[PDB]
Ligand binder design. Structure first.
Ligand SMILES: Nc1ncnc2c1ncn2[C@@H]1O[C@H](COP(=O)(O)OP(=O)(O)O)[C@@H](O)[C@H]1O
Ligand SMILES: Nc1ncnc2c1ncn2[C@@H]1O[C@H](COP(=O)(O)OP(=O)(O)O)[C@@H](O)[C@H]1O
Ligand code: BEF
Ligand code: BEF
Ligand SMILES: [Mg+2]
Ligand SMILES: [Mg+2]
Lengths: 100, 50, 164, 49, 417, 417
């Protein structure tokens, strides 16, 4: 399965995920001090059968996200700063997300 | 042209003036709410000293 | 966005314990608290989304009363004869449109409200289904026996309690 | 919004229609540039195989 | 400004007014948005607006006041009324409202109501505590509707024969059973003319469903009363809409103690439109007819009655038969023992250029003793017993020759002795 | 350069012109792109282009001007017109436009309009402030269309019998009810020939929907007026496209005070195509027919009327029956009480080599008093009363023998006395 940038990141509190939007990317202008999440990337480490009804159920109910691996990129340790710009490039066929 | 001349009156006359819609009325009422005072009061000391 | 609201209302988990009008009212309350969190003031607003297909068209409640406290939801009786109100309570007018019902905090509060509403719905359903067996005897395994009371499995999401 | 009137047709209307045609050509060229910039900044980019 | 002056005025005066107001090019759009923009401009430079119409309450909660000339159709000309009026004055669907209205701001486009003035031609105080329609006690017709004008024209003899065959009264149900090609249009036209000339106090309403538009325009300005019609040009949704509109208007008017008279043509086409508009219930007979599909038409025909408290409602719906299909046939079978006054118009006499083609042998009316006097009824029975052994065309020409010489049915009866 | 000279010219002269211009191998492609490249070359070496056609406005905002010979189909020959013209001249769908056009540069491929010259055969100033179609007041037909030519040929007697059975006028609705195998094609051809020979001032339009292509090509160059036809070769999308095209053209022409006459064949096939092209609404009767699927055809048949202000529109749509399916049957039932002039052509007389097979007993026209004089109507009624007791084949041969000797219907009537 292909990896996605959905805002469904398990094994993390909502306070750490508050810096991201509904599309899983930090808002333009949100500073970060230490190692924190800025892009909500997840990859399916399992098999098929990922149905949209299951997606909307897991978004509200159900157990944790089964196949994610938490492949989301975080800012390296020690380096700080304030985000000022985000760029996105998408392959043809793939629909652009709301931030794009 | 003065705030005190507006605090001591209700908005029944505000809607009587044309071009006074939801925008202006809501803006004035929310500004006076953020300022704590109420639209429509009763005071006699006016205007000191103008 | 309306397509997603549809997908949600038609793709609910418990179509029986959560009827369609219940999904409508739950989404309305979720979007209402979202719009409440939007503005810095406190103003109660319902969305009245088209139950069948269409999108939302919010309103603005104003609570006709001679008071002035929180004037965002205040309309005096004397200064209300315009717009043919002529009433004492129920001035829920359409002064407010342009609700955003898909951003991050709105989605989170909507998910929370939906969880609360489905919990309330399943509670009401189990209670008014298994209350008919009030005089007769009920059989069922015990979920868990606590100190103050014990809770019992009676069936599909069926709970009973026996006091200490 | 009312560029078009009628008086002394034989030459006044000829000049007015020439001007209106120039205006329409300018508007079409501007819409063309708009659409070209749109399809250039919205075309899907190539990233990697 | 009042609404009806701009509604029932020709569109040319509206074009002139809109051009004089210094507005956009007005003649390029519908009459609806034309008058909408005209009212908006007159409100921007002028006083409050004065509107009127009939009220329809949707499943949404609010109400729409629609005009009579557009057959109560949606558009910019409708009047939005909030549920607050429906809670204060306790409004109902079909309420004839007339009052003050205001222009719309952002978020709205319809003229909102400001203050009602006349509700069903009555004061809101008197209309507050009233009696419902279904709560009334139906009865038989007692006051007979005189259809003879007295002049004895070339065609009023038709109406005369009608008085000879079907005494109509306030609260009776009339079913005109006639195949096509038979000449019922001018018959109903003359009936409406006579009933408006003899009884101008009672409201008169006609309804043309699935009818040709030319007949609609030639009837909407030839007879009295609002001529509401839903031609075949529109789907069945508009037909059921106007059916509910007219039936609720009649119910409200008879609740306000007014003698209401409905002329419906034809009832088979209305029932067919009902059948195709309401969802199916699974059970289907021959001809593509559903079981519940006739429930609403039946109700519509059963609304007519003679109220004991005040006023009455008399419907006259014609049933089109002999078309080849089974829909009309099963409709006429279901409505056969329904109306208490049938009038049969056989095409055999119509094709022979003998008008009015009236099957006097098969026509009749029940409880006619409560509409005519004693000797009048005796003469009618004598005439019936005399004509019954005769056929149809011969009896028709005999009646025509015996009625052409006389001018009044009374002299006719005494000369027939 | 004008467009019509290159449109209605044979393709051979186009091949010669393209070979003389020193171009690519031209005969290897469609006529459409052939004439497109020819116009492009003539514009590269020459003056402005002069085009014409009928305008269609999409849901996109712009407009396409399409020619009559391609049945108004998409291709390189269309003319793109910006919404700026639709805002300035306030254009509408179906506007007959003719004017100057320019070649396209990069980003474009259609010839863009430069300046309109003739809009619906009228000046833009006169067409600016006008009257809408639906805003007109329909009426009954007053001017009768004379179908007798006077020569009395071997086949014009058909038209004569038509004048004997269905007096056609400006604003009437004609429904030809005939099973297959019955000979209606040459009937409509002769009707068109006679109505163009007797009334050459009024525009004549024919429409062949779901028809064989050979008949299309043999009719497109035998009768007058643009012969627009959508054969069965294409899906129903093109059928509804050409239906809207022709109906909007007729509406614009009658708005410009022109007597428009439409010949539509057949209406059952057009309604079937409508049924399969418009999305379903859930409700379905027997035969695979939807409720709203007949709304647009109904409208199409209801567009015809007699305008009181100026001009009129007369449609003559034939209904194909007796095919076995239920679609045609339910269509003919829905359109039975729709047209005000039916003409029945029974196959029993057609199979006996007795033409024209016309069911005179079941045929007729309403309000014929407004089309014929007094003694003419009296003679027609006498003839109807005489022929009615007879059957179909015997009456048909009697009428044929009585009409072959005479040359004019007047002498026929006086000799029938
Ligand atoms: N009372 C009458 N006197 C003279 N002619 C009549 C009379 N009633 C009907 N007709 C004739 O019969 C025809 C009926 O036409 P129409 O109203 O279309 O039929 P229907 O009423 O069956 O729909 C008319 O053309 C008219 O000439
Ligand atoms: N007026 C007429 N005179 C002679 N023959 C006729 C006439 N009308 C029809 N026919 C014959 O009937 C046939 C009808 O063919 P066609 O046009 O396909 O029928 P339809 O138009 O009913 O489909 C023709 O072959 C023709 O020979
Ligand atoms: F009988 Be008609 F078609 F009204
Ligand atoms: F030409 Be046939 F009547 F289809
Ligand atoms: Mg009729
Ligand atoms: Mg044929």
């Amino acid at each position: 399965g292909p990896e996605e940038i959905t805002a469904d990141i398990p094994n993390v509190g909502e306070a750490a995920l508050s810096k991201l939007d509904e599309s899983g990317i930090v808002y333009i202008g949100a500073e970060v001090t230490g190692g924190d999440i800025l892009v909500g990337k997840v990859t399916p480490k399992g098999e098929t059968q990922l149905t949209p009804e299951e997606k909307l159920l897991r978004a509200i109910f159900g157990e944790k996200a089964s196949d994610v691996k938490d492949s989301s990129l975080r800012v390296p340790n020690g380096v700080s700063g304030t985000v000022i710009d985000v760029q996105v490039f998408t392959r043809d066929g793939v629909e652009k997300d709301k931030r794009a | 042209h003065y705030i005190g001349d507006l605090v001591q009156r209700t908005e029944v006359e505000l809607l009587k003036t044309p071009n006074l819609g939801k925008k202006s009325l809501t803006e004035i009422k929310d500004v006076l709410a953020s300022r704590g005072l109420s639209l429509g009061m009763r005071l006699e000391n006016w205007p000191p000293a103008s | 966005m309306n397509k997603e609201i549809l997908a949600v209302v038609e793709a609910v988990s418990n179509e029986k314990a959560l009827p369609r009008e219940k999904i409508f009212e739950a989404l309305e309350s979720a979007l209402a608290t979202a719009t409440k969190k939007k503005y810095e003031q406190e103003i109660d607003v319902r969305v009245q989304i088209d139950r069948k297909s269409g999108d939302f068209d919010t309103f603005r409640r104003w609570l006709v009363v001679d008071e002035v406290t929180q004037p965002t939801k205040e309309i005096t009786l004397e200064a209300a004869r315009y717009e043919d109100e002529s009433l004492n309570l129920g001035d829920y007018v359409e002064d407010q449109i342009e609700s955003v019902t898909f951003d991050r905090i709105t989605t989170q509060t909507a998910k929370q409200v939906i969880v609360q509403k489905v919990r309330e719905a399943e509670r009401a359903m189990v209670v008014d289904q298994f209350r008919e067996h009030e005089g007769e005897i009920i059989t069922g395994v015990v979920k868990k026996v606590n100190r103050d009371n014990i809770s019992l499995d009676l069936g599909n999401n069926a709970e009973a309690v026996i006091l200490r | 919004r009312w560029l078009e009137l009628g008086l002394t047709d034989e030459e006044k209307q000829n000049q007015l229609e020439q001007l209106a045609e120039q205006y329409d050509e300018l508007k079409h060229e501007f819409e063309k540039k708009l659409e070209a910039k749109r399809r250039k900044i919205t075309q899907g980019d190539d990233l990697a195989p | 400004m009042n609404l009806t002056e701009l509604k029932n005025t020709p569109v040319s005066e509206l074009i002139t007014l809109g051009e004089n107001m210094g507005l956009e090019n007005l003649a390029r759009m519908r009459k609806q948005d034309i008058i909408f923009a005209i009212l908006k401009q007159h409100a921007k430079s002028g006083e409050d607006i004065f509107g009127d119409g009939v009220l329809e309450i949707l499943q949404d909660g609010f109400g729409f006041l629609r005009s009579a000339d557009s057959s109560y159709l949606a558009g910019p000309d409708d009047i939005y009324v909030s549920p607050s009026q429906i809670r204060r004055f306790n409004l109902r669907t079909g309420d004839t409202i007339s009052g003050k209205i205001r222009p719309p701001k952002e978020g709205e486009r319809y003229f909102a109501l400001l203050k009602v003035n006349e509700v069903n031609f009555d004061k809101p105080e008197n209309a507050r505590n009233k009696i419902l329609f279904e709560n009334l006690t139906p009865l038989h017709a007692n006051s007979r509707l005189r259809m003879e004008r007295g002049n004895g024209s070339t065609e009023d003899l038709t109406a005369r024969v009608l008085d000879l065959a079907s005494p109509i009264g306030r609260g009776q149900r009339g079913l005109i059973v006639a195949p096509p090609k038979a000449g019922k249009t001018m018959l109903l036209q003359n009936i409406a003319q006579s009933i408006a000339y003899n009884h101008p106090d009672c409201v008169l309403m006609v309804l043309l469903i699935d009818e040709r538009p030319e007949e609609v325009t030639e009837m909407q300005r030839l007879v009295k009363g609002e001529v509401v019609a839903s031609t075949f040009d529109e789907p069945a949704s508009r037909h059921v809409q106007v059916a509910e509109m007219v039936i609720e208007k009649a119910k409200r008017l008879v609740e306000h103690k007014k003698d209401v008279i409905i002329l419906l043509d034809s009832i088979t086409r209305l029932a067919r439109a009902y059948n195709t508009v309401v969802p199916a219930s699974g059970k289907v007979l021959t001809g593509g007819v559903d079981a519940n599909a006739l429930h609403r038409p039946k109700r519509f025909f059963g609304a007519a009655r003679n109220v004991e408290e005040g006023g009455s409602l008399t419907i006259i719906a014609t049933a089109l038969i002999d078309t080849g299909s089974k829909m009309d046939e099963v409709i006429y079978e279901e409505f056969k023992g329904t109306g208490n006054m049938e009038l049969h118009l056989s095409r055999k006499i119509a094709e022979k250029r003998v008008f009015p083609a009236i099957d006097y042998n098969r026509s009749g009316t029940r409880k006619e003793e409560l509409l005519t006097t004693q000797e009048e009824l005796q003469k009618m029975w004598i005439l019936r017993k005399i004509i019954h052994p005769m056929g149809e065309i011969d009896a028709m020409e005999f009646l025509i020759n015996k009625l052409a010489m006389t001018k009044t049915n009374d002299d006719f009866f005494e000369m027939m002795k």
